[PDB]
Amino acid sequence: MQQEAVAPEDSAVVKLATDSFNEYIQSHDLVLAEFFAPWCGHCKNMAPEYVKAAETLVEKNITLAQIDCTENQDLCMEHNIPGFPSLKIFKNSDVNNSIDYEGPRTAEAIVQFMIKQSQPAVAVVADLPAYLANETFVTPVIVQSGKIDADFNATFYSMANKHFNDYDFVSAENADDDFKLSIYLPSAMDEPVVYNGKKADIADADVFEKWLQVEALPYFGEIDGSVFAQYVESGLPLGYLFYNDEEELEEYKPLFTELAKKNRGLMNFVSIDARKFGRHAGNLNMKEQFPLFAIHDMTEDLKYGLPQLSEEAFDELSDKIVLESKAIESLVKDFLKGDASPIVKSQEIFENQDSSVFQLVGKNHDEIVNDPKKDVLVLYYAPWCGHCKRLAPTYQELADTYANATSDVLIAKLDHTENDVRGVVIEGYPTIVLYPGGKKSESVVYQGSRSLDSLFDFIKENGHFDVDGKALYEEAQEKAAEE
Numbered sequence: 431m432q433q434e435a436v437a438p439e440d441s442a443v444v445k446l447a448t449d450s451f452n453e454y455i456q457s458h459d460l461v462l463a464e465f466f467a468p469w470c471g472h473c474k475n476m477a478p479e480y481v482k483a484a485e486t487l488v489e490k491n492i493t494l495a496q497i498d499c500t501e502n503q504d505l506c507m508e509h510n511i512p513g514f515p516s517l518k519i520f521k522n523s524d525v526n527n528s529i530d531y532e533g534p535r536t537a538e539a540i541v542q543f544m545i546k547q548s549q550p551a552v553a554v555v556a557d558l559p560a561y562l563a564n565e566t567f568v569t570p571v572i573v574q575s576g577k578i579d580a581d582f583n584a585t586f587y588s589m590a591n592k593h594f595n596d597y598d599f600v601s602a603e604n605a606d607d608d609f610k611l612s613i614y615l616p617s618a619m620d621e622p623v624v625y626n627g628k629k630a631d632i633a634d635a636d637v638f639e640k641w642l643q644v645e646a647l648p649y650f651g652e653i654d655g656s657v658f659a660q661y662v663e664s665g666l667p668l669g670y671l672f673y674n675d676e677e678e679l680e681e682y683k684p685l686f687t688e689l690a691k692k693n694r695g696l697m698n699f700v701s702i703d704a705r706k707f708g709r710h711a712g713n714l715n716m717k718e719q720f721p722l723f724a725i726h727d728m729t730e731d732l733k734y735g736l737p738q739l740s741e742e743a744f745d746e747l748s749d750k751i752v753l754e755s756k757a758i759e760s761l762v763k764d765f766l767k768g769d770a771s772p773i774v775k776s777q778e779i780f781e782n783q784d785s786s787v788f789q790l791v792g793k794n795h796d797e798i799v800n801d802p803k804k805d806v807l808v809l810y811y812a813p814w815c816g817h818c819k820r821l822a823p824t825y826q827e828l829a830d831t832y833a834n835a836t837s838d839v840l841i842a843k844l845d846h847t848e849n850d851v852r853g854v855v856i857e858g859y860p861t862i863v864l865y866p867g868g869k870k871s872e873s874v875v876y877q878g879s880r881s882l883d884s885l886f887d888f889i890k891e892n893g894h895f896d897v898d899g900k901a902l903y904e905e906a907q908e909k910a911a912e913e
């Protein structure tokens with residue numbers, strides 16, 4: 431048959447239900463539970479890999495279970511299941527400590543993650559250099575060492591537990607040395623980042639958290655879903671190097687590792703695989719032309735990057751693209767100074783056609799919307815949007831009402847899907863803002879039905895020129911009656 435989400439009932443996988451779950455978790459110390467619905471295609475896509483991991487994992491006295499939520503709603507509510515599939519790890523035979531699996535749903539990724547969960551949250555050692563030399567680490571290593579006080583120790587363990595799948599935690603206690611808290615980063619293992627001893631402070635878990643959010647990031651690692659939130663959680667701008675092959679990345683690693691060490695505290699730098707993630711470039715409003723270097727200020731949502739080819743030039747490009755070191759270096763220091771121009775996404779300005787409705791792009795938006803001789807209505811839209819299309823004939827008859835009788839009003843539309851705009855970012859579409867004047871507040875976002883009269887009255891009531899479009903509409907109608 432075609433592949434189903436439920437595992438074959440004779441496999442290593444264990445079927446768990448409302449009345450059997452608790453007894454099962456609390457007699458088994460490490461359990462991966464899949465909360466699924468049979469109608470779910472991603473649940474079907476992963477079943478073969480789930481079974482293949484469950485097999486590989488019997489060996490280790492670690493269970494993989496399945497709960498079908500369409501039959502176990504009580505259970506799915508109790509575990510707060512948001513969607514399918516949901517993979518939860520129950521540890522220590524306790525149905526109240528679970529964590530989410532968020533990694534690749536492949537057999538190999540699932541067995542690796544589950545074996546890790548059997549390992550202690552803290553490595554308790556005396557010989558620390560042996561420990562650090564023996565393992566090739568892929569994540570930062572958080573080490574407490576020296577004379578460790580009880581209060582800090584509790585915080586440390588609590589963090590080891592909370593951050594179990596983010597960092598490795600080591601306790602190298604030595605009552606003859608001064609306390610240290612250190613981070614070892616994978617590229618610079620012979621050179622820890624040591625906390626700056628407000629020691630009473632660092633046993634506060636918030637102080638501890640904030641320190642980690644910034645300091646416990648590779649200087650120049652690879653970004654992806656598993657780790658993106660960590661870069662966002664630092665609170666700091668993100669530099670992206672898009673690369674299209676590992677040999678090409680290897681050319682940029684030394685410069686970006688230096689730039690990263692230099693500006694650690696100020697921004698981050700990540701490598702990002704163009705083959706896997708080229709798409710993301712438009713998200714940074716860059717062209718998909720790699721390698722590329724861009725900076726995203728996430729807090730401000732401004733985007734910056736190094737100039738690229740026009741799409742014409744690029745399509746006649748017989749050469750590898752190179753980013754010059756100096757241009758990269760230049761943009762970084764400019765960005766961090768405040769000198770550096772964000773990139774604004776825009777369609778080509780329209781040659782424009784016989785509509786009274788002005789079609790704006792991100793390029794020409796401000797000039798026109800700002801102009802003090804106005805009252806400017808802008809409809810922000812997407813063509814992916816029924817309601818915006820619904821409105822079209824109303825928006826057109828509103829534009830015609832004014833075009834006929836006055837120049838004191840501009841009625842305009844911008845496709846937000848294809849054009850950045852600043853200061854006016856309501857989530858959905860349609861969104862409508864009225865710009866009355868360059869010595870007038872904008873704070874006139876429209877709420878209401880998009881009815882013609884609501885819109886006429888809006889412009890009338892909140893417009894600098896008090897243009898009474900209703901009256902004016904009534905006029906046209908009588909004059910059309912040859913009157």
Ligand SMILES: [Ba+2]
Nearest residue numbers: 578603604605
């Ligand atoms: Ba002791």
